[PDB]
């Protein structure tokens, strides 16, 4: 009498929202948010360094 | 290696009961099925019970009279007769089997009118 | 809306499978348990089992008992790991219930004068919120966003497959004429019976009751129960079927999303100044975690479990230091001279 068992693996299918990523990080960039006043013309900006 | 050795055979009269024993020498009934079989004075072996985890069977020659019952904690099978009649009379063996097939030396059962 | 997730599900039945520890010992129960899953926060539970619950009906289960359906209202059920448990919503063969933490578990019901019970040890384990250990939920608090399963059947990306239901030997069926073996299949379906007592014979009677000579015991044929319909889950107590081993795939109850929780708010500890010095007096009432790092190139982390209340000294420079209570928001602080 013979059986063939059979079995493998998959994702659970509640890691759809909590699931960990991998990444890979280089090149930063600064940003800066500021309140500019200068001969009381002021000002709120967003600039790149 | 395995060894089977039957007990409880012995000699009674028509219409009674025997209880034979048959116990392993290490744990081996979970793995394997045992069957308890008959071999009547110059015929070849035939099967009286088989038992299984999952169930038992019984043959019809001996259904309503014989029942097989396993306990594996004793590391033993016991098979219950009642209502013996001549025609009973053979050399019981408890089989071990499973991967490998191991046979008892037998137990010698009469029954007189 | 409901009715149209609902369909779906009448395309299978309930089936037995073996569950190892019975009442007494190891049977195919009908209420076998395929596999349990708990991921989120509360302890709410979803649970993987072989019977049928709603079936457009409110509150009850529909399973099968050597071949018979029988339908029984949910209300008839317990089960608990070791202390009790609270059903909340079922569907298909999946149950999402409120439980308490336990390395096993165990589901029970009562027939007229059977009990069925199965247990199998799976862990069931708890999975507090926050930086508070706590054991169970608490009352009020602050409110943050948390992971737990879904109390409706909405569906969504998430398919398992089914397959044909299989073919099994039924002893009854199989029995005794006054001189041949008797096969009288249940009028009104095929079936099939393999009997190797003359040559090797396989006969497929259909809705005719068929004595069978040259068999004399009924151990030499087994006769097979057939079912063209009712798609079955891929499982491994029940045996396959022929062709293609598949059929389709259907959606999932009861999934993982997100819902908002409260969470225990741990009391304000006993602060104290010195000279580049700190002292904290610390009571907790349950173990909650303090996380205390420098606020300089350097952190000197320090993670800690505090479960007693305690005494404890630091030190704070010019260049700042931070600290993190429990669920409480994070606190800075700056020295100076005196």
């Known amino acids: 009498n013979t059986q063939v068992s059979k079995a493998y693996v998959m994702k659970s299918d509640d890691c759809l929202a909590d699931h960990a990523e991998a990444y890979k990080a280089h090149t930063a960039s600064v940003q800066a948010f500021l309140n500019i006043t200068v001969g009381e013309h002021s000002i709120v900006t967003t600039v790149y360094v | 290696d395995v060894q089977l050795q039957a007990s409880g055979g012995g000699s009674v009269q028509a219409g009674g009961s025997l209880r034979l024993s048959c116990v392993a020498s290490?744990?081996?009934?979970?793995?394997?099925?045992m069957g308890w079989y008959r071999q009547v004075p110059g015929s070849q072996r035939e099967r009286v019970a088989l038992?299984?985890?999952?169930?038992?069977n019984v043959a019809g020659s001996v259904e309503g009279r014989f029942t097989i019952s396993r306990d594996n904690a004793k590391n033993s099978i016991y098979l219950q007769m009642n209502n013996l009649k001549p025609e009973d009379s053979a050399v019981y063996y408890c089989?071990?089997?499973?991967?490998?097939?191991?046979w008892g030396q037998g137990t010698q059962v009469t029954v007189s009118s | 809306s409901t009715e149209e997730l609902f369909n779906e599900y009448k395309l299978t039945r309930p089936y037995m499978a073996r569950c190892i520890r019975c009442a007494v010992g190891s049977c195919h129960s009908p209420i076998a348990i395929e596999a349990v899953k708990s991921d989120g926060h509360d302890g709410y539970v979803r649970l993987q089992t072989s019977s049928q619950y709603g079936l457009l009906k409110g509150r009850t289960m529909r399973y099968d008992m050597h071949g018979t359906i029988k339908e029984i209202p949910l209300h008839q059920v317990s089960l608990y790991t070791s202390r009790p448990c609270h059903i909340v919503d079922g569907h298909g063969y999946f149950l999402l219930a409120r439980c308490p933490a336990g390395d096993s578990i165990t589901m029970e019901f009562k027939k007229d004068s059977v009990r069925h019970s199965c247990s199998v040890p799976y862990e069931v384990k708890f999975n507090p919120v926050g930086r508070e250990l706590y054991t169970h939920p608490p009352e009020h608090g602050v409110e943050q966003a948390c992971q737990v399963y879904a109390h409706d059947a909405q569906n969504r990306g998430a398919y398992v497959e089914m397959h044909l239901p299989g073919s099994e030997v039924d002893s009854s069926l199989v029995s005794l004429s006054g001189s041949s073996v008797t096969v009288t299949p249940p009028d009104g379906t095929s079936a099939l019976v393999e009997c190797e007592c003359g040559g090797t014979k396989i006969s497929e009677t259909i809705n005719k009751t068929k004595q069978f000579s040259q068999c004399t015991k009924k151990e030499q044929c087994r006769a097979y129960r057939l079912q063209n319909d009712k798609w079955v889950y891929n499982s491994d107590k029940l045996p396959k079927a022929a062709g293609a081993t598949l059929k389709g795939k259907l959606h999932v109850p009861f999934l993982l999303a997100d819902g908002k929780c409260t969470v225990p708010l741990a009391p304000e500890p006993m602060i104290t100044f010195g000279f580049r010095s700190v002292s904290l007096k610390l009571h907790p009432k349950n173990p909650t975690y303090l996380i205390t790092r420098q606020l300089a190139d350097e952190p000197h982390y320090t993670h800690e479990l505090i479960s007693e209340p305690a005494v404890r000294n630091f030190t704070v420079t010019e260049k700042g230091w931070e600290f993190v209570w429990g669920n409480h928001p994070p606190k800075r602080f700056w020295a100076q001279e005196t």
């Open positions: 290490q744990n081996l009934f979970e793995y394997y099925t």
């Open positions: 089989r071990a089997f499973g991967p490998a097939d191991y």
């Open positions: 038992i299984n985890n999952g169930g038992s």
